[PDB]
Amino acid sequence: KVFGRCELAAAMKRHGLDNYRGYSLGNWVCAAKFESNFNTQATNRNTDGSTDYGILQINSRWWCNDGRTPGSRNLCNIPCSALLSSDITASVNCAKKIVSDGNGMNAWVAWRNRCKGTDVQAWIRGCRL
């Protein structure tokens, strides 16, 4: 499924994101743009087996299992694939352990480089939320 910025935004609302662990919605929406492109299908393999699924690039060495990444410890106890379907439940409910485990949204190489410290509100602007 590609979400729309605005439509993304409400979505993730809809779901507990906003504030959650004290990230702003915005944090979440620019995050999830630059990581995924609004597109929940998008998959991403790095060099160590490992791959990266869904709007919010969860990896498969710790968060979800996908049947080819051997290091795997299947910390949100969900298969990869779940990740990519055109409802965020997953992800977001998966996202929720990554973002509370220690590192915040820094655990996301992209927020950090492109969203951390910018005015992430300008994501949500124009949104009915």
Give the ranges where the chain is alpha helix by DSSP (H). 5-14, 25-36, 89-98, 109-114
Return the closest-CA partner of residue 7 out of 79, 69, 86, 85: 86
Distance CA 85, CA 121 (A): 27
42 DSSP 8-state letter? -
Per-domain boundaries in the chain: 1-129
Distance CA 129, CA 116 (A): 22
- The experimental method is X-ray
Query: Which among 18, 48, 52, 119 is annotated as catalytic?
Result: 52
Map residue 59 onto helix, strand or coil. strand
Return the closest-CA partner of residue 80 out of 109, 50, 105: 50
Residue 119, annotated as binding a ligand:
no
Instruction: Identify residue 24 by its one-letter amino acid code.
Output: S
Distance CA 38, CA 124 (A): 14
Instruction: Identify residue 40 by its one-letter amino acid code.
Output: T
Instruction: Identify residue 113 by its one-letter amino acid code.
Output: N
Query: Which among 18, 35, 48, 66 is annotated as catalytic?
Result: 35
Q: For this structure, is 52 an active site residue?
A: yes
Resolution (A): 2.0
Within a 10 A sphere around the Cβ of 112, how many other Cβ atoms? 15
What's the CATH code, domain 1-129? 1.10.530.10
